Design a protein around this ligand. Structure first.
Ligand SMILES: [Ca+2]
Length: 586
């Protein structure tokens, strides 16, 4: 383990994080929106699950055009969630329970309702004009409409620019129309960002930050037209010119130094960057401890499987090997380095992992939910669990498009309507995809009980901000699962206990090697920690599946699995349907 600097323990390496989506976690006042008092009331539940830390998605003052990722004031809690004092009390309560607290740092862009943007947009001459990207129209089209400065596509569909009537220029917004991108080329802007979004929260005791699209701050000069890679789209991915840009490491080093110099009590701050996509070299540049940038990052390859690289909402076939390799991208690069990794399958931007990677049928949803827990329990990195994942939540079914709340759905729908027609093959493919892939599968209210109609998220007379998934009626809820010894929830409790008990090799294990990589059913691997060897055999299928342990001998003992403990034959070399096993040799 001495030739593996990544094994150096840190609180944030071995902490299990639980991610809370504040709108959808717990309503305490029957207005249909989750809130901070709701979260506070459920911290004991989170601790009992086995979490060491929480990450709360944005709770700052926001018009909610992108459900909190459009921030109008970094230093004020959205009144619907509570007051600043409510938040400070929540941070303190979290700490007094022995858990860490990280907040969502969203500084690629802010809301157009932020005072910075209200000033910037007011004239061409004000001190904050170049805190954002303002450009004249490229020209005007045959119908007299202004043409945007370039061909860049928004992450939510259509053009990445919005025209301002008053000042007669476009502003850049990679996300929705009211999320203008901040201009990190402006040093005054960077300093103000650090003071407001970072310093304020350090002063109020956060243990770290999850950094929203942290790889987008550096734009290539000139904002040039992007390559025409999609021949059936007016607008093109800006990635070559916005993703991991030439100043991105400079900016992250600067922000890291700001944090180091602003902390007052010498505490260890974690940063996890939502970096999206990166070569292994880029990942190392971000997460090597010696680089003083990020602690770790999220990489999207494993959550991208089964979607077109050109458009997330066009489905494509994939096989198990694709997912194995994409998952391994999270962690293999850290082997023998001072880097660190993340491990997760769910977040507020993803559909449910059982639906995607298990089998959500009534027959298989429990056992395959447990299989995913076995897998995650054994992988190296900081583990994240998303609200409802521990219940074995599944995608919702048979919703019409108009029921989806997400701006990502609304904007993409409208772009397709405009470009291809509402009644088109392009629309049909989109509608097929949203049923599997939409972020909204993560955002339906948390299911605390079987109570009609709101599943204990709110009182029975309240109207939730977004519709409940019908799965609460099928026993997918906290109250029913606590009482069922065979539940996914009770299994996740066991999985986290197992992971912690064997943390040297589960959290800090190294020399990861795939066994039978090509296998369409068997996901198998070994890891090392000094004299210890961990071996996993995981059957991602409804069929029985054979496996072999490399260098098999009597030392390999069955330490965890999802089939009944007293009914498993550890010496058998065939897995039952959806069976997973973790063996450890000393
Ligand atoms: Ca509420």
């Amino acid at each position: 383990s001495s030739a593996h600097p990544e094994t150096e323990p840190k609180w944030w390496k071995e902490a299990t994080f639980y991610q809370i989506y504040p709108a959808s976690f717990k309503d305490s006042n029957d207005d249909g929106w989750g809130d901070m008092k709701g979260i506070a009331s459920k911290l004991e539940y989170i601790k009992e699950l086995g979490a060491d830390a929480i990450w709360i998605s944005p709770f700052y003052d926001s018009p909610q055009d992108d459900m909190g990722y459009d921030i109008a004031n970094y230093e004020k809690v959205w009144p619907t969630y509570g007051t600043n004092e409510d938040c400070f009390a929540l941070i303190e309560k979290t700490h007094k329970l022995g858990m860490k607290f990280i907040t969502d740092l969203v500084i690629n862009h802010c809301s157009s309702e932020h005072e910075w943007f209200k000033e910037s947009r007011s004239s061409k001459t004000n001190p904050k004009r170049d805190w954002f990207f303002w450009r004249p129209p490229k020209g005007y089209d045959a119908e007299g409409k202004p043409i945007p400065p370039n061909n860049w596509k928004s992450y939510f569909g259509g053009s990445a620019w919005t025209f301002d009537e008053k000042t007669q220029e476009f502003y850049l917004r990679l996300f929705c129309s009211t999320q203008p991108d901040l201009n990190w080329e402006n040093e005054d802007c960077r300093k103000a960002i650090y003071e407001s979004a970072v310093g304020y929260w350090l002063d109020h005791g956060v243990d770290g930050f999850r950094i929203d699209v942290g790889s987008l701050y550096s734009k290539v000069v000139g904002l040039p037209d992007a390559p025409v890679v999609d021949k059936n789209s007016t607008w093109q991915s800006s990635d070559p010119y916005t993703l991991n840009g030439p100043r991105i490491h400079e900016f992250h080093q600067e922000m890291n130094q700001f944090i180091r110099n602003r902390v007052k009590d010498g505490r260890e701050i974690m940063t996890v960057g939502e970096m999206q996509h990166a070569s292994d070299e880029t990942k190392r540049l971000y997460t090597s401890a010696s680089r003083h940038e990020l602690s770790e990052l999220f990489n999207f390859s494993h959550t991208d499987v089964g979607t077109s690289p050109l458009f997330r909402y066009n489905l494509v076939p994939f096989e198990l090997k694709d997912w194995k390799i994409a998952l391994a991208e999270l962690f293999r690069y850290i082997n023998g380095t001072d880097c660190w990794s993340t491990i997760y399958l769910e977040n507020h931007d993803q559909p449910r992992s059982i639906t995607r990677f298990g089998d959500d049928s009534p027959k298989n949803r429990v056992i395959s939910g447990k299989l995913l827990s076995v897998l995650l329990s054994a992988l190296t990195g900081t583990l994240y669990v998303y609200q409802g994942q521990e219940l074995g939540q599944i995608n919702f079914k048979n919703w019409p498009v108009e029921k989806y709340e997400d701006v990502e759905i609304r904007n993409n729908y409208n772009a397709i309507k405009e470009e291809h027609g509402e009644n088109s093959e392009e629309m049909k493919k989109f509608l097929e995809a949203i049923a599997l892939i939409s972020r909204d599968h993560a955002r339906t209210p948390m299911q605390w009980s079987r109570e009609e109609p709101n599943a204990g998220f709110s009182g029975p007379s309240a109207k939730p901000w977004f519709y409940l998934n019908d799965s609460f009626r099928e026993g997918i809820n906290v109250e029913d699962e606590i009482k069922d010894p065979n539940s996914v929830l009770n299994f996740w409790k066991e999985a986290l206990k197992f992971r912690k008990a064997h943390k040297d090799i589960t959290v800090y294990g190294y020399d990861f090697e795939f066994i039978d990589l090509d296998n369409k059913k068997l996901f198998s691997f070994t890891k090392k920690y000094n004299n210890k060897t961990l071996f996993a055999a995981l059957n991602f299928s409804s069929d029985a599946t054979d496996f072999k342990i490399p260098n098999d001998d009597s030392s390999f003992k069955l330490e965890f699995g999802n089939y009944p403990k007293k009914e498993v034959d550890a010496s058998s070399r065939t897995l039952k349907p959806w069976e997973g096993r973790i063996y450890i040799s000393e």
